[PDB]
Design a protein around this ligand. Structure first.
Ligand SMILES: O=C(O)CN(c1cccc(-n2ncc(C(=O)O)c2C2CC2)c1)S(=O)(=O)c1ccccc1
Length: 288
């Protein structure tokens, strides 16, 4: 569609913001708040509807991991609850295949999930599928050619450079080539025939480097780095360019939004969020 939606996130506490950015004119709209604050969620779109999945509500009076699935309709500017997942999943990743939402990994307290489940909007039902070979929280998830990829994360002991791919007709996960960088809390997306991994935390520093996996060659190659180091960033694709939103650079919760042009291999700053934040969910759909 036409707008980049950012939902939730964190600054001092988990946030309820829903704000939509219009690349064609630089404007930001503040829309209906989430019913429950959440950071560490993921966003996706199915059938023009925006979905917010998992996360946690970190507040002064609690830390509650979320199993929730909530649906925002831009025509109504209203959120509606959907069926909840089998388990809470903070620091989640999600991907959409053939109209179904895959929820991957994430945490529930000290439980680091390898489990994966699939939502069918037409039935308002979740079902578990085969689990990953690795437990992954802060996991980047992307879909390319109707295969599901889980990239990096944290397994409960180590941050990971490993990645793996889910083959739905076989209900099976297989490792792919590992990245050249350990990345947890990175932004992962697909552009053309490559899976991009931008930023994240490597155990020592937040990262500005960006690398992409070419599914034809099975190799990871670095591209131009972002202007800002960032972990727990939001990421999406809009008209053939990658947009990264917010995150944490080790000093500040960023309001910076950067845009990658793959033809020129350059990043530029395109706008600022209305306030700095990390751990947002991001997706693109029609204006409301
Ligand atoms: O949930 C939480 O603990 C916090 N948030 C969050 C959200 C998504 C992913 C990750 N994440 N997962 C594994 C690692 C890992 O350090 O290896 C991480 C972090 C990002 C590198 C965490 S946050 O509120 O947005 C937030 C982010 C940064 C600073 C303060 C708060």
């Amino acid at each position: 569609g036409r707008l980049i939606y950012t939902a939730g996130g964190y600054f001092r506490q988990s946030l309820s913001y829903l704000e939509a950015y219009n690349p064609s004119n630089g404007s930001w709209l503040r829309l209906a708040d989430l019913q429950v604050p959440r950071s560490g969620l993921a966003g996706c779109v199915v059938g023009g509807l925006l979905y917010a999945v998992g996360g946690r509500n970190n507040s002064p009076d609690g830390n509650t991991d979320s199993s929730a699935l909530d649906c925002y309709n831009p025509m109504t500017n209203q959120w509606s609850p959907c069926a909840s997942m089998s388990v809470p999943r903070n620091r989640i990743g999600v991907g959409v295949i053939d109209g179904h939402i895959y929820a991957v990994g994430g945490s529930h307290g000290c439980i680091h999930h390898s489990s994966v489940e699939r939502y069918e909007p037409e039935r308002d039902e979740w079902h578990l599928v085969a689990p990953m070979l690795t437990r992954r929280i802060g996991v980047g998830v992307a879909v390319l050619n109707r295969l599901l990829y889980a990239v990096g994360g944290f397994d409960g002991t180590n941050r990971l450079n490993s990645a793996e791919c889910y083959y739905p007709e076989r209900n099976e996960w297989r490792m792919i080539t590992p990245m050249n960088t350990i990345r947890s809390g990175a932004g992962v997306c697909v552009l053309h025939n490559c899976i991009y991994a931008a930023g994240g935390y490597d155990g020592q520093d937040q990262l500005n480097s960006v690398e992409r996996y070419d599914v034809e060659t099975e190799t990871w190659t670095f591209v131009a780095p972002m202007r800002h180091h960032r972990s727990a960033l939001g990421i999406t694709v809009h008209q053939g360019k990658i947009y990264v939103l917010g995150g944490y650079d080790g000093h500040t919760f960023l309001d910076s939004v950067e845009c990658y042009d793959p033809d020129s291999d350059t990043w530029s700053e395109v706008t600022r969020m209305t306030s700095g934040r990390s751990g947002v969910g991001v997706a693109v759909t029609m204006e409301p």
